[PDB]
Amino acid sequence: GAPATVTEQGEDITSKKDRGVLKIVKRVGNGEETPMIGDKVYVHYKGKLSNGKKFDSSHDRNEPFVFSLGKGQVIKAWDIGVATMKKGEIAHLLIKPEYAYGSAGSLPKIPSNATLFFEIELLDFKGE
Numbered sequence: 001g002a003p004a005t006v007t008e009q010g011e012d013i014t015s016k017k018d019r020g021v022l023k024i025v026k027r028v029g030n031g032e033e034t035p036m037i038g039d040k041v042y043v044h045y046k047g048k049l050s051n052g053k054k055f056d057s058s059h060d061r062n063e064p065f066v067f068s069l070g071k072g073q074v075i076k077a078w079d080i081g082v083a084t085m086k087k088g089e090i091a092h093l094l095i096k097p098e099y100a101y102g103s104a105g106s107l108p109k110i111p112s113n114a115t116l117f118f119e120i121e122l123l124d125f126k127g128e
């Protein structure tokens with residue numbers, strides 16, 4: 001399935017190269033710019049714990065998720081991963097707990113030391 005494909009084939013986009021955030025580009029975007037710290041970013045996504053159990057999707061709010069990139073308003077792996085993406089791109093990320101909610105986790109959605117999987121669609125990004 002999607003996560004195994006990432007484990008097996010995905011690129012390690014961490015600085016430390018600790019395989020904490022792996023990425024596969026599933027749909028190539030158009031345009032060359034990937035967004036900078038402080039950019040306002042518009043996405044669709046779906047996420048799940050790597051072993052099923054809990055699930056979340058922007059389409060469940062019928063609206064894109066919007067955040068400010070690189071300000072830690074999202075988990076580290078998103079600040080890292082979404083910055084590598086181009087407008088129109090769809091990507092798969094698989095994330096170790098260290099770039100997500102660590103050992104403390106976050107009930108009720110997230111257990112301790114959870115690995116997470118997302119599909120992210122970068123819709124757009126604007127300057128701050």
Ligand SMILES: COc1cc2cc(c1OC)OC[C@H](CO)OC/C=C/[C@@H](C)[C@@H](C)OC(=O)[C@@H]1CCCCN1C(=O)[C@H]2C1CCCCC1
Pocket residue numbers: 045047048049054055056073074075078106109110116
């Ligand atoms: C730990 O709690 C949650 C985790 C997740 C979703 C989430 C949530 O409740 C706060 O609720 C949906 C909420 C609004 O209804 O989404 C806004 C994005 C929140 C940002 C503020 C943080 C908490 O979420 C994230 O950083 C990441 C990356 C962006 C998208 C949401 N994501 C999640 O961790 C998901 C989580 C993914 C695994 C499956 C369970 C939900």
